[PDB]
Amino acid sequence: LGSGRPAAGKIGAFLRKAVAAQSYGLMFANGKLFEATGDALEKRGQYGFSALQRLDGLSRRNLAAVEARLGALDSAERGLKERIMTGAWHFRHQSNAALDDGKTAAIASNHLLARESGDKALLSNHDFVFFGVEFSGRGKQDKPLNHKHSTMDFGANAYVVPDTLPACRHGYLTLTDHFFNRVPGGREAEHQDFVGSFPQMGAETGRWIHEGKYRQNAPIFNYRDMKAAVALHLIEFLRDSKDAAFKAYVFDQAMQSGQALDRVLNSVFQAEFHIPRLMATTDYAKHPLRPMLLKEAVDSVNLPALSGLVSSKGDAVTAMWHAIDKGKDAVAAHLLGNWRFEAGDFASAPPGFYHELNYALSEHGASVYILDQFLSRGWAAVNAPFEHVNSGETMLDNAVKYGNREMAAALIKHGADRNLLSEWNGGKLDALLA
Amino acid sequence: EEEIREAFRVFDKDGNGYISAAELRHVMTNLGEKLTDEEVDEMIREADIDGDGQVNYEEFVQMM
Amino acid sequence: PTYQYNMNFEKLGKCIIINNKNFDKVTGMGVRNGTDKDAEALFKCFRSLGFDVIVYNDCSCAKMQDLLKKASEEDHTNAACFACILLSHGEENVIYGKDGVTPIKDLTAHFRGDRCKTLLEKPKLFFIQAARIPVEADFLFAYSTVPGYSWFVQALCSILEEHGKDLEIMQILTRVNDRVARHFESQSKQIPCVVSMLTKELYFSQ
């Protein structure tokens, strides 16, 4: 019971400091945008702590850049800075997948899903969890103010965590979307009624946000400099603004209320917070914002929600076509037993599907599980060629075309005539069988 | 900064160098700061440079 | 001559859409994401005009050659014209197949006036989308080397779905050049070129 129990926190504070250094190590090393500005880094098998040291180095540069742009702050501007500096934030992440179990909410990044099975080359920040930043400060169980970030409705469930989580000590924030660094105009903004009351502002919101000489140099700030950045970058816009009504709403009503401050910061910018690798915690809040639809759950694999969304055999057929196209296996397994279809159910083409049955099962990235279980029940013909897309070709034609060795194995296992392929396939089949 | 090298050694399974990997799993699972069991998996993945079941606290601080 | 192509036929003509989305590792090219949305917009748009649209996805160089070769050998007596759409990668006078490259001259080789009498005196439309030239008679090319987040295909459909049955083909493609020119300024001055060997004006009557 000596000095080991408090020092036991080093294990964890050091591991979260090493795991976070890998996600940033992927962003600086593999980021094409960081090479043009020279902010890129070296290449290692396990990126060291120098990746986090350049995060603080990059944050101090962007902070001192906007600090030198304004410098002489007005007296009323100093109070607005401390207002945002002292205001606690709530980070909002939306999606359609059930990411919690009622006790712990685990949200993995876009890169951690790859180890388990354009924009990715420009930034290489897909090893981070995306969050929409709310500046209300009215509690974590409070209703989410904003439903969309950069005109993107991510999902029907909102997972909110306060900035008190230890994982936020290593995160970073961009003023808008790190890729598309253009806060949209008034017509695209979410809360239209608030922006409509300020006319001369709606023409100044449609802008590109940047800092360096390159237009795409989206400003990046660490946790230590988040509040000091969004405050100064707001003052930089308020000083250039000609709107006499909006230049008075930020100094009067916005500093008093937390909701008015969010409407200002969510309209001037589109703040995006990122957490490396994984965001697993028990202190969170889940608010169902809107009802979820059928296609929303099939793509994100939300089987518990999908059980109630299907209330008829037609909705079950419609849900099956979405699993075939997007290539989800478990979604087809639940619909398999709960609803017993027939062969003529999937015979026609549903409205909104620009591919037919046989081609979707043989498309690029299609699942053999969706295909094998479909031919085992005999709900589709084995050698009937397509009559709408790539006509004159069979199931095995696409299987050998893309080179999928496993898809061609099951098609012949169900009796595929090897002599029904066109000339552009011929004898390449034997190189894929074994 | 330099005191981090002492931080792992206070609860080393042996004396110097190799530390038990499953020990660091249950340490963060209960003792120390109350961490989440879902996060514990990803912390040990990048930690064990050997990639089997051990801890190299001496080299890990030097490499990073 | 009425300075206007004769559109008094049964069917408007054939329309082939090549949609090469995935490519082999030997080519070293990436997947063209979003081209399925371009192929769907071009299908329902040209089908609305009156074409017999048939779509082919991820065709090899030998498949594309034989596809247009067998198309030019078809009977186009009851066809008012003919159209071809290409969606793949490209470089210089060549587009990318799934297994290599093929030149544009070979795709229009069997469509010359001597090698296709049924389409003689009828316009052969060619719309090319190549990211990163033969001069005959009654031919039209829509060459676009601008990648999109595509802007060209969406601007072509948005005008043909609004003025495809009331304006001439150059009025359509001219407004398409202005629409894509606006996107270079909004960023959400590269412009496609129109090579025209038409002898008459092109309207889309039934």
XYZ file of C-alpha atoms in Angstrom:
704
model
C 0.000 0.000 0.000
C 3.009 2.250 -0.535
C 3.650 4.662 -3.408
C 2.654 2.005 -5.958
C -1.114 2.472 -5.955
C -0.949 6.113 -7.166
C 1.993 5.301 -9.453
C -0.083 2.481 -10.972
C -1.763 5.175 -13.077
C 1.453 5.543 -15.070
C 0.593 2.230 -16.734
C -2.302 3.473 -18.843
C -1.292 7.115 -19.036
C 1.809 5.801 -20.837
C -0.030 3.252 -22.990
C -2.670 5.771 -24.081
C 0.277 8.066 -24.870
C 1.903 5.342 -27.022
C -1.280 4.242 -28.810
C -2.153 7.866 -29.587
C 1.348 8.400 -31.001
C 0.618 5.692 -33.589
C -2.577 7.274 -34.936
C -0.850 10.642 -35.306
C 2.178 8.818 -36.701
C -0.046 7.530 -39.496
C -1.364 11.045 -40.151
C 2.005 12.798 -40.464
C 3.885 10.020 -42.278
C 1.177 8.980 -44.756
C -0.496 12.387 -45.098
C -0.084 13.978 -48.518
C -1.340 17.351 -47.261
C 1.392 17.500 -44.602
C 4.163 17.069 -47.190
C 3.202 20.190 -49.156
C 3.386 22.269 -45.964
C 6.386 20.280 -44.700
C 4.567 19.277 -41.497
C 4.974 15.581 -42.355
C 7.184 13.238 -40.339
C 9.389 10.151 -40.636
C 8.480 6.493 -41.202
C 8.757 3.842 -38.490
C 7.220 0.475 -37.728
C 6.051 1.823 -34.362
C 5.875 5.616 -34.479
C 7.546 7.055 -31.395
C 6.651 9.978 -29.166
C 8.074 12.417 -31.735
C 4.682 12.287 -33.470
C 3.049 13.777 -30.375
C 5.886 16.291 -30.008
C 5.103 17.563 -33.511
C 1.423 17.780 -32.553
C 2.352 20.290 -29.851
C 4.800 21.864 -32.296
C 2.100 22.228 -34.945
C -0.433 23.508 -32.400
C 1.870 26.246 -31.088
C 2.503 27.416 -34.661
C -1.186 27.712 -35.559
C -1.948 29.335 -32.195
C 0.831 31.911 -32.579
C -0.268 32.517 -36.181
C -3.809 33.628 -35.329
C -2.421 35.379 -32.240
C -0.220 37.547 -34.472
C -3.084 38.240 -36.897
C -5.143 40.017 -34.213
C -2.689 40.725 -31.387
C -4.359 43.853 -30.010
C -7.620 42.458 -28.637
C -10.503 44.746 -27.729
C -11.782 44.889 -24.156
C -15.098 43.315 -25.163
C -13.144 40.725 -27.162
C -11.128 39.705 -24.091
C -14.328 38.750 -22.277
C -15.514 36.618 -25.192
C -12.201 34.737 -25.130
C -12.502 33.868 -21.431
C -16.126 32.876 -22.078
C -15.025 30.173 -24.520
C -11.882 29.363 -22.506
C -13.944 28.571 -19.398
C -16.766 26.816 -21.263
C -16.821 23.032 -21.048
C -17.529 21.223 -24.312
C -19.572 18.175 -25.296
C -18.375 16.023 -28.198
C -21.084 14.361 -30.296
C -20.610 11.266 -32.463
C -23.469 9.949 -34.594
C -23.841 6.646 -36.447
C -26.362 3.887 -37.139
C -24.518 0.975 -35.487
C -25.224 -0.084 -31.903
C -21.895 0.995 -30.407
C -22.882 0.536 -26.738
C -24.474 -2.145 -24.557
C -26.014 0.038 -21.840
C -22.822 0.061 -19.741
C -19.779 0.773 -21.947
C -19.725 2.696 -25.236
C -16.921 1.579 -27.566
C -16.484 3.540 -30.806
C -13.646 2.394 -33.060
C -12.005 4.526 -35.732
C -12.159 3.983 -39.489
C -8.702 2.349 -39.447
C -9.138 -0.062 -36.523
C -11.906 -1.777 -38.511
C -9.328 -2.749 -41.154
C -7.105 -4.803 -38.834
C -10.170 -6.966 -38.091
C -11.903 -6.949 -41.516
C -8.459 9.891 -51.887
C -9.185 11.441 -48.503
C -7.344 8.567 -46.809
C -4.144 9.464 -48.671
C -4.559 13.235 -48.286
C -4.820 13.223 -44.477
C -4.442 9.619 -43.228
C -6.489 10.631 -40.175
C -8.868 7.657 -40.467
C -7.253 6.230 -37.307
C -9.342 8.765 -35.353
C -12.932 8.862 -34.114
C -14.894 11.850 -35.414
C -16.848 14.085 -33.037
C -19.110 17.094 -33.439
C -18.288 19.669 -30.782
C -21.153 21.291 -28.875
C -20.408 24.312 -26.682
C -23.586 24.357 -24.582
C -22.204 23.208 -21.241
C -25.743 22.431 -20.043
C -24.977 18.851 -19.024
C -24.108 15.607 -20.781
C -27.694 14.315 -20.564
C -28.944 17.538 -22.169
C -30.556 17.305 -25.590
C -28.083 17.528 -28.502
C -28.310 20.992 -30.033
C -26.938 20.103 -33.481
C -27.948 17.026 -35.479
C -25.682 17.536 -38.517
C -21.982 18.315 -38.960
C -21.026 19.791 -42.348
C -24.538 18.946 -43.615
C -23.899 15.262 -42.814
C -26.492 13.346 -40.790
C -24.223 10.526 -39.633
C -26.863 8.500 -37.808
C -29.955 8.376 -35.632
C -28.069 7.834 -32.346
C -25.905 10.521 -30.734
C -23.129 9.442 -28.353
C -22.108 12.462 -26.262
C -19.060 12.588 -23.984
C -17.831 15.630 -22.015
C -14.323 16.999 -22.408
C -13.459 15.554 -18.968
C -12.589 12.149 -20.444
C -8.853 11.341 -20.214
C -8.777 10.416 -23.915
C -9.327 14.073 -24.866
C -5.891 15.005 -23.474
C -4.273 13.677 -26.677
C -6.955 14.567 -29.232
C -6.973 17.445 -31.689
C -9.588 19.730 -33.220
C -10.045 21.261 -36.663
C -12.196 24.335 -37.228
C -14.207 22.516 -39.915
C -13.966 19.113 -41.571
C -10.260 18.308 -41.830
C -10.749 17.163 -45.436
C -13.423 19.534 -46.790
C -12.374 22.730 -45.008
C -15.262 24.883 -46.230
C -18.022 25.889 -43.814
C -21.092 26.039 -46.086
C -23.265 29.050 -46.745
C -26.524 30.033 -45.125
C -28.752 27.836 -47.287
C -26.783 24.742 -46.236
C -26.481 25.566 -42.527
C -28.539 23.453 -40.135
C -30.309 25.996 -37.920
C -31.728 28.152 -40.718
C -33.962 30.242 -38.442
C -31.015 31.548 -36.407
C -28.854 32.454 -39.411
C -31.845 34.008 -41.180
C -32.124 36.652 -38.453
C -28.607 37.907 -39.324
C -28.424 38.819 -43.035
C -24.970 40.369 -43.499
C -23.406 37.296 -41.851
C -24.865 34.708 -44.241
C -22.727 36.045 -47.069
C -19.502 35.774 -45.030
C -19.960 32.212 -43.736
C -19.408 30.551 -47.117
C -15.623 30.593 -46.839
C -12.563 28.358 -46.873
C -10.829 28.103 -43.495
C -7.036 27.848 -43.532
C -3.850 29.281 -42.042
C -0.831 28.537 -44.225
C -0.168 29.664 -47.773
C -2.034 26.619 -49.106
C -5.827 26.787 -49.089
C -6.088 23.209 -47.785
C -3.820 23.867 -44.765
C -6.590 23.274 -42.250
C -5.548 24.631 -38.825
C -4.798 21.922 -36.259
C -4.781 22.472 -32.490
C -4.139 20.193 -29.524
C -6.309 19.972 -26.405
C -4.219 22.635 -24.653
C -4.996 25.132 -27.448
C -8.533 24.211 -28.571
C -10.379 26.902 -26.614
C -7.775 29.595 -27.319
C -8.046 28.819 -31.054
C -11.811 28.760 -31.658
C -12.053 31.932 -29.566
C -9.401 33.860 -31.504
C -10.524 32.487 -34.875
C -14.027 33.681 -33.983
C -12.712 37.146 -33.082
C -10.875 37.142 -36.419
C -14.243 36.703 -38.149
C -16.143 39.149 -35.929
C -13.595 41.892 -36.635
C -13.919 41.402 -40.405
C -17.719 41.111 -40.213
C -19.867 43.990 -41.450
C -23.024 42.674 -39.736
C -23.922 45.103 -36.957
C -26.546 42.684 -35.607
C -24.239 39.662 -35.347
C -21.307 41.656 -33.943
C -23.629 42.553 -31.040
C -25.195 39.116 -30.493
C -21.830 37.525 -29.675
C -20.989 40.182 -27.065
C -24.433 40.329 -25.426
C -26.702 37.286 -25.632
C -24.068 34.702 -26.596
C -21.896 35.164 -23.499
C -24.929 34.867 -21.202
C -26.388 31.646 -22.633
C -24.698 28.409 -23.639
C -27.187 27.680 -26.405
C -26.608 31.025 -28.130
C -22.839 30.473 -28.024
C -23.191 27.098 -29.752
C -25.422 28.555 -32.477
C -22.668 31.112 -33.107
C -19.745 28.677 -33.126
C -21.656 25.979 -35.031
C -22.545 28.526 -37.747
C -19.206 30.337 -38.060
C -17.317 27.025 -38.059
C -17.952 23.262 -38.135
C -15.658 22.103 -35.332
C -14.400 18.527 -35.645
C -12.755 16.726 -32.723
C -10.733 13.539 -33.181
C -9.724 10.837 -30.696
C -7.005 8.341 -31.703
C -7.685 4.650 -32.289
C -10.574 3.866 -29.940
C -13.023 5.709 -27.671
C -14.216 3.262 -24.996
C -15.812 4.677 -21.853
C -18.653 4.202 -19.384
C -19.335 7.926 -18.802
C -21.339 8.889 -21.890
C -24.877 9.690 -23.040
C -26.935 8.192 -25.873
C -29.790 10.264 -27.320
C -31.967 8.790 -30.101
C -32.319 11.884 -32.270
C -34.535 10.604 -35.094
C -36.183 7.320 -36.086
C -33.902 4.973 -38.008
C -34.758 3.511 -41.409
C -34.254 0.102 -43.006
C -31.230 0.928 -45.172
C -29.643 2.793 -42.247
C -29.344 -0.381 -40.139
C -28.346 -2.789 -42.925
C -25.249 -0.750 -43.792
C -24.067 -0.267 -40.194
C -25.116 -3.811 -39.154
C -27.582 -2.877 -36.393
C -29.427 -6.179 -36.099
C -31.391 -5.439 -32.866
C -32.886 -2.322 -34.462
C -33.502 -4.177 -37.739
C -35.826 -6.647 -35.985
C -38.534 -4.023 -35.489
C -37.967 -2.134 -38.733
C -39.137 -5.190 -40.708
C -42.888 -5.602 -40.196
C -43.848 -7.363 -43.449
C -42.477 -9.906 -45.896
C -41.998 -7.069 -48.385
C -39.835 -5.095 -45.964
C -37.829 -8.276 -45.358
C -37.246 -8.727 -49.094
C -36.314 -5.047 -49.403
C -33.895 -5.432 -46.486
C -32.284 -8.485 -48.105
C -31.411 -6.619 -51.313
C -29.554 -3.997 -49.266
C -27.464 -6.722 -47.616
C -26.591 -8.223 -51.011
C -25.370 -4.928 -52.484
C -23.454 -3.520 -49.507
C -22.097 -6.992 -48.704
C -23.226 -7.659 -45.129
C -23.306 -11.287 -44.001
C -24.924 -11.226 -40.552
C -27.718 -8.955 -41.802
C -28.722 -11.683 -44.262
C -28.538 -14.313 -41.505
C -31.154 -12.636 -39.300
C -33.554 -12.054 -42.205
C -32.998 -15.673 -43.274
C -34.832 -17.405 -40.428
C -37.186 -14.690 -39.203
C -38.719 -14.473 -42.699
C -38.994 -17.488 -45.016
C -39.057 -16.146 -48.574
C -39.604 -17.931 -51.896
C -37.839 -18.031 -55.254
C -40.230 -15.573 -56.906
C -39.762 -12.972 -54.166
C -36.302 -11.893 -55.369
C -37.105 -12.574 -59.037
C -37.924 -9.001 -60.078
C -35.828 -5.887 -59.472
C -36.818 -3.639 -56.547
C -37.334 0.079 -57.223
C -34.099 1.968 -56.645
C -31.830 -0.992 -57.493
C -29.992 -0.524 -60.796
C -28.725 -4.131 -60.796
C -30.526 -7.457 -61.035
C -30.401 -10.523 -58.781
C -27.739 -12.629 -60.504
C -25.325 -9.739 -61.086
C -25.549 -8.386 -57.530
C -24.610 -11.810 -56.143
C -21.582 -11.848 -58.485
C -20.609 -8.173 -58.159
C -17.173 -7.017 -57.023
C -16.918 -7.502 -53.270
C -19.998 -9.723 -53.053
C -20.117 -12.260 -50.234
C -19.802 -15.981 -50.915
C -21.917 -16.503 -47.788
C -24.714 -14.464 -49.354
C -24.092 -16.394 -52.578
C -23.662 -19.928 -51.207
C -26.748 -19.704 -48.988
C -28.656 -18.304 -51.983
C -27.752 -21.174 -54.325
C -28.178 -23.828 -51.622
C -31.836 -22.846 -51.198
C -32.142 -22.599 -54.986
C -33.731 -19.139 -54.866
C -31.787 -18.190 -58.018
C -30.767 -19.875 -61.251
C -27.235 -21.241 -61.468
C -26.283 -20.518 -65.101
C -28.900 -18.002 -66.273
C -26.929 -15.145 -67.881
C -27.657 -11.514 -67.144
C -30.181 -9.632 -69.278
C -29.509 -6.039 -68.163
C -25.835 -5.572 -67.212
C -22.906 -7.285 -68.959
C -25.394 -9.326 -70.965
C -24.188 -12.621 -72.378
C -22.172 -13.417 -69.240
C -22.844 -15.733 -66.307
C -22.115 -15.798 -62.576
C -18.702 -17.406 -63.096
C -17.848 -14.712 -65.661
C -17.639 -12.016 -62.982
C -16.039 -14.430 -60.498
C -13.090 -15.052 -62.831
C -13.163 -11.455 -64.115
C -12.224 -9.843 -60.792
C -10.117 -12.831 -59.717
C -12.094 -13.925 -56.643
C -10.871 -17.484 -56.082
C -13.422 -18.289 -53.362
C -16.435 -17.116 -55.385
C -15.469 -19.290 -58.360
C -15.061 -22.319 -56.085
C -18.655 -22.224 -54.822
C -20.176 -21.488 -58.241
C -18.669 -24.629 -59.780
C -19.581 -26.524 -56.601
C -23.230 -25.757 -57.453
C -22.816 -26.933 -61.053
C -21.638 -24.006 -63.174
C -21.077 -24.856 -66.839
C -17.403 -24.000 -67.360
C -18.087 -23.703 -71.116
C -20.643 -20.872 -70.824
C -18.067 -18.107 -70.334
C -17.202 -15.734 -73.156
C -13.830 -15.749 -74.910
C -12.449 -13.194 -72.419
C -12.373 -15.819 -69.644
C -11.550 -19.128 -71.341
C -8.994 -21.175 -69.424
C -8.040 -18.671 -66.708
C -10.363 -20.613 -64.382
C -7.865 -23.387 -63.609
C -5.359 -20.894 -62.171
C -7.929 -19.896 -59.516
C -9.361 -23.296 -58.537
C -6.254 -24.471 -56.665
C 10.355 12.531 -17.842
C 13.197 10.353 -16.559
C 10.978 9.153 -13.691
C 8.842 7.223 -16.200
C 11.587 4.581 -16.349
C 10.997 3.994 -12.630
C 7.215 3.858 -13.091
C 7.107 0.406 -14.694
C 9.766 -1.112 -12.429
C 7.840 -0.519 -9.184
C 5.600 -3.490 -10.076
C 7.914 -5.593 -12.224
C 7.065 -9.290 -12.072
C 10.782 -10.159 -11.933
C 13.564 -7.633 -11.183
C 14.841 -5.927 -14.330
C 13.642 -5.909 -17.926
C 10.895 -8.401 -18.713
C 7.489 -7.690 -17.162
C 4.447 -9.946 -17.364
C 1.960 -8.938 -20.057
C -1.142 -10.483 -18.478
C -0.146 -8.651 -15.288
C -0.491 -5.258 -16.991
C -3.886 -6.414 -18.287
C -5.353 -7.110 -14.842
C -3.563 -4.106 -13.312
C -5.420 -1.655 -15.556
C -8.585 -3.774 -15.333
C -8.943 -3.139 -11.586
C -6.025 -1.344 -9.930
C -4.704 2.106 -10.790
C -7.114 4.315 -12.681
C -10.461 2.651 -13.374
C -9.972 1.890 -17.073
C -12.344 0.218 -19.524
C -11.853 -3.411 -20.520
C -12.524 -2.647 -24.200
C -9.609 -0.194 -24.299
C -7.288 -2.643 -22.499
C -7.079 -4.813 -25.626
C -5.738 -2.073 -27.909
C -3.206 -0.891 -25.310
C -1.461 -4.270 -25.071
C -1.462 -4.706 -28.866
C 0.902 -1.794 -29.533
C 2.792 -2.225 -26.245
C 4.187 -5.754 -26.631
C 6.811 -5.285 -29.337
C 7.486 -9.028 -29.109
C 3.891 -9.786 -30.100
C 3.172 -12.820 -27.929
C 2.875 -12.074 -24.213
C 5.563 -10.005 -22.500
C 6.465 -6.413 -21.616
C 9.704 -4.634 -22.586
C 9.514 -1.540 -20.391
C 13.227 -0.727 -20.687
C 13.358 -0.621 -24.489
C 9.873 0.840 -25.020
C 10.738 4.100 -23.247
C 14.046 4.318 -25.121
C 12.469 3.641 -28.524
C 9.816 6.312 -27.913
C -31.451 19.567 -96.600
C -33.440 21.043 -93.696
C -30.195 21.830 -91.788
C -31.439 19.303 -89.227
C -30.876 15.570 -88.831
C -33.799 13.348 -89.797
C -35.345 11.923 -86.615
C -38.250 10.114 -88.314
C -37.241 6.583 -87.330
C -38.672 3.887 -85.074
C -35.984 3.814 -82.383
C -33.724 6.767 -81.632
C -30.664 4.516 -81.722
C -28.294 2.408 -79.670
C -26.535 3.648 -76.530
C -23.625 1.721 -74.995
C -22.338 2.762 -71.560
C -18.918 1.446 -70.517
C -18.463 1.717 -66.732
C -14.959 0.573 -65.747
C -14.926 0.955 -61.955
C -12.374 -1.688 -60.906
C -9.013 -2.357 -62.551
C -6.413 -5.103 -62.345
C -3.287 -4.845 -60.213
C -1.187 -5.030 -63.394
C -2.497 -1.591 -64.403
C -1.681 0.064 -61.073
C -4.907 2.092 -61.066
C -7.282 2.691 -58.176
C -11.014 2.143 -57.883
C -13.165 4.905 -59.389
C -15.545 5.544 -56.507
C -18.826 7.220 -57.399
C -18.814 6.113 -61.042
C -21.741 3.817 -60.237
C -23.657 7.025 -59.516
C -22.546 8.444 -62.872
C -23.591 5.275 -64.710
C -27.027 5.320 -63.059
C -27.612 8.980 -63.936
C -26.557 8.448 -67.558
C -28.817 5.395 -67.881
C -32.135 6.949 -66.840
C -31.241 10.154 -68.708
C -30.444 8.655 -72.118
C -33.304 6.186 -71.649
C -35.596 9.190 -71.152
C -34.401 10.688 -74.447
C -35.345 7.519 -76.329
C -32.222 5.371 -76.578
C -31.932 1.608 -76.084
C -29.336 1.883 -73.337
C -27.277 -1.181 -72.388
C -24.664 -0.980 -69.621
C -21.408 -2.935 -69.325
C -19.284 -2.758 -66.167
C -15.538 -3.456 -65.935
C -14.739 -4.537 -69.481
C -11.333 -5.662 -70.693
C -9.632 -4.116 -73.715
C -10.647 -7.094 -75.855
C -14.200 -6.906 -74.494
C -14.532 -3.206 -75.350
C -13.182 -3.723 -78.875
C -15.493 -6.641 -79.679
C -18.433 -4.866 -78.019
C -18.292 -1.851 -80.344
C -17.198 -4.056 -83.258
C -20.338 -6.176 -82.933
C -22.321 -2.965 -82.394
C -21.143 -1.370 -85.646
C -21.954 -4.605 -87.512
C -25.594 -4.372 -86.392
C -28.402 -3.020 -88.556
C -29.059 0.672 -87.857
C -31.645 1.234 -90.589
C -34.465 1.975 -88.121
C -32.083 3.907 -85.833
C -31.989 7.697 -86.038
C -28.420 7.873 -84.707
C -26.016 6.154 -82.294
C -24.382 7.080 -78.990
C -21.504 5.714 -76.921
C -20.519 6.611 -73.354
C -17.135 5.868 -71.764
C -16.443 6.002 -68.011
C -12.893 4.959 -67.067
C -9.380 6.330 -66.640
C -7.427 7.920 -69.468
C -4.246 9.678 -70.504
C -3.671 10.896 -74.080
C -6.120 9.734 -76.781
C -6.455 6.459 -74.831
C -8.803 5.169 -72.144
C -8.161 2.511 -69.514
C -9.647 -0.959 -69.677
C -9.697 -3.318 -66.731
C -6.624 -5.150 -68.093
C -4.761 -2.419 -69.990
C -5.233 0.487 -72.379
C -6.864 0.923 -75.780
C -6.844 3.936 -78.124
C -9.906 5.963 -79.039
C -9.217 5.556 -82.768
C -9.780 1.794 -82.502
C -13.090 2.311 -80.680
C -14.262 4.498 -83.583
C -12.419 2.445 -86.219
C -15.327 0.229 -87.305
C -17.712 3.227 -87.205
C -16.268 5.021 -90.243
C -18.543 5.778 -93.179
C -17.217 2.857 -95.221
C -17.304 0.316 -92.368
C -20.848 1.154 -91.204
C -23.285 2.006 -93.998
C -26.380 1.739 -91.786
C -25.129 4.630 -89.627
C -23.938 6.605 -92.664
C -25.441 10.120 -92.845
C -26.383 9.638 -89.163
C -24.550 11.243 -86.217
C -22.344 8.996 -84.072
C -22.216 10.492 -80.576
C -19.269 9.760 -78.280
C -19.081 10.933 -74.657
C -15.755 10.248 -72.931
C -14.983 10.672 -69.219
C -11.259 10.038 -68.669
C -9.614 11.087 -65.405
C -5.958 10.887 -64.342
C -8.190 11.741 -82.386
C -9.829 10.751 -85.680
C -11.710 13.299 -87.779
C -14.441 11.705 -89.895
C -17.997 12.723 -90.814
C -21.083 13.067 -88.595
C -19.053 12.424 -85.433
C -19.146 14.244 -82.097
C -16.759 13.839 -79.161
C -17.231 15.070 -75.579
C -13.729 14.774 -74.131
C -13.366 15.613 -70.428
C -10.093 15.242 -68.508
C -11.357 16.801 -65.253
C -11.841 14.513 -62.229
C -14.727 15.207 -59.880
C -15.621 14.744 -56.229
C -18.096 13.712 -61.501
C -19.102 17.299 -62.252
C -19.221 16.750 -66.023
C -21.621 13.791 -66.034
C -23.886 15.401 -63.432
C -23.945 18.636 -65.446
C -24.709 16.755 -68.670
C -27.639 14.855 -67.152
C -29.062 17.895 -65.339
C -29.380 19.698 -68.693
C -30.571 16.752 -70.798
C -33.179 16.010 -68.107
C -34.383 19.615 -68.529
C -33.688 20.608 -72.133
C -32.834 17.339 -73.898
C -35.966 17.415 -76.072
C -36.084 21.151 -76.889
C -32.486 22.336 -77.473
C -29.836 21.428 -80.020
C -26.922 19.194 -79.053
C -24.471 22.107 -79.078
C -26.776 24.189 -76.874
C -26.719 21.265 -74.433
C -22.942 20.774 -74.405
C -22.304 24.533 -74.273
C -24.337 24.899 -71.076
C -22.493 21.844 -69.742
C -19.194 23.655 -70.327
C -20.532 26.643 -68.380
C -21.799 24.471 -65.516
C -18.427 22.760 -65.042
C -16.738 26.163 -65.362
C -18.755 27.337 -62.350
C -17.526 24.390 -60.266
C -13.895 25.435 -60.762
C -14.700 28.698 -58.938
C -16.917 27.379 -56.128
C -14.577 24.416 -55.447
C -16.982 21.883 -53.973
C -9.986 26.682 -65.256
C -10.374 23.192 -66.714
C -13.251 22.712 -69.172
C -14.111 19.745 -71.433
C -13.774 20.147 -75.191
C -16.329 19.373 -77.904
C -15.015 18.019 -81.214
C -17.861 18.350 -83.724
C -17.949 16.926 -87.253
C -21.726 17.275 -87.549
C -23.221 18.413 -90.851
C -26.719 19.245 -89.546
C -28.402 20.356 -86.343
C -29.294 17.619 -83.856
C -32.726 17.540 -82.212
C -34.403 14.729 -80.264
C -37.854 14.241 -81.719
C -39.614 10.898 -81.342
